[PDB]
Amino acid sequence: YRGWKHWVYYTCCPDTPY
Amino acid sequence: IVCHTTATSPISAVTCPPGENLCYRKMWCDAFCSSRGKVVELGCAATCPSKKPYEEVTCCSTDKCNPHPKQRPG
Numbered sequence: 173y174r175g176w177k178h179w180v181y182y183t184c185c186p187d188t189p190y
Numbered sequence: 191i192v193c194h195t196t197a198t199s200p201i202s203a204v205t206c207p208p209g210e211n212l213c214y215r216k217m218w219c220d221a222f223c224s225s226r227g228k229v230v231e232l233g234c235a236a237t238c239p240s241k242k243p244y245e246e247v248t249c250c251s252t253d254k255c256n257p258h259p260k261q262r263p264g
Contacts, residue, residue, distance in 0.1 A: 180218050180228070180229040180230075181229055181230045182228055182229070182230060182259075183196065183197075183198050183228075183229070183230045183231070183258075183259040183260070184198050184199070184259040184261065185198065185199075186196055186198050186199065186200070188199070188200040188202075189199040189200055
């Protein structure tokens with residue numbers, strides 16, 4: 173069961189600055 | 191009442207139709223820090239009669255409550 177998911181979330185660098 | 195959704199750099203469908211009062215949004219971090227805590231804000235709820243210390247958010251009744259990231263706030 174490997175995931176290494178990220179605890180909290182993040183603001184900057186969303187994905188639309190594409 | 192509106193509340194930038196994520197913001198960060200670009201922008202998305204702002205405005206919060208539900209809960210006509212505050213648009214929530216705060217942060218996480220450990221303590222006062224004021225540097226780390228790379229997290230985000232909630233985003234509208236309904237109200238904030240509460241008043242607890244550490245949580246994640248209280249209320250944002252404005253049109254630009256969404257602050258800046260943790261790493262580089264400005």
